[PDB]
């Protein structure tokens, strides 16, 4: 049906919008601390600490697989990146501090992306 082609032409724009948003968020981590998944070879016990790992490349693979149905799912993943880091790492570390900074600077990008999703449907 054509009614599925109109749905696919919207998901394809959402996927096109979410790509810009992901790029803007990832520019707030110039140290690339959140670029890749935490290595299980380097942190063997990680999954004892954190049940749902998340990172930017993992979000990206999903994204290009049109796996985000909406902005709320995309946000959830972003928030995991931040909250996982803030549990696993102590307050006086470079990792925890990078998340605090990513959260603070990522808010401005997400406050406007909310309006652009609602605005353009
Ligand atoms: Na902690």
Superfamily of domain 1-121 in CATH is Bromodomain-like (1.20.920.10)
Residue 96 CA to ligand 1 center (angstroms) comes to 9
Domain range annotation of the chain: 1-121
Q: Give CA–CA dist 119/7, Å, rounded.
A: 17
For every residue of 103-114, which 3-state class applies, written as one string? HHHHHHHHHHHH
3-state helix, strand, coil split of the chain in percent (to 5) is: 70, 0, 30
Measured in angstroms, the resolution is 2.3
Residue 38 CA to ligand 1 center (angstroms) comes to 16
Residues whose beta carbons lie less than 5 angstroms from ion ligand 1 = 87
Residue 84 CA to ligand 1 center (angstroms) comes to 9
Experimentally determined by: X-ray
Residue 47 CA to ligand 1 center (angstroms) comes to 14
């Amino acid at each position: 049906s054509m009614e599925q082609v109109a749905m696919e032409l919207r998901l394809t724009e959402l996927t096109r919008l979410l790509r810009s948003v992901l790029d803007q968020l990832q520019d707030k981590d110039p140290a690339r601390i959140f670029a890749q998944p935490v290595s299980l070879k380097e942190v063997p016990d990680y999954l004892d600490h954190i049940k749902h790992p998340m990172d930017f490349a993992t979000m990206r693979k999903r994204l290009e697989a049109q796996g985000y149905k909406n902005l709320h799912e995309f946000e959830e993943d972003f928030d995991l990146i931040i909250d996982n880091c803030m549990k696993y790492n102590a307050r006086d570390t470079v990792f925890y501090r990078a998340a605090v900074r990513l959260r603070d600077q990522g808010g401005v990008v997400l406050r406007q992306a909310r309006r652009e999703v609602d605005s353009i449907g």
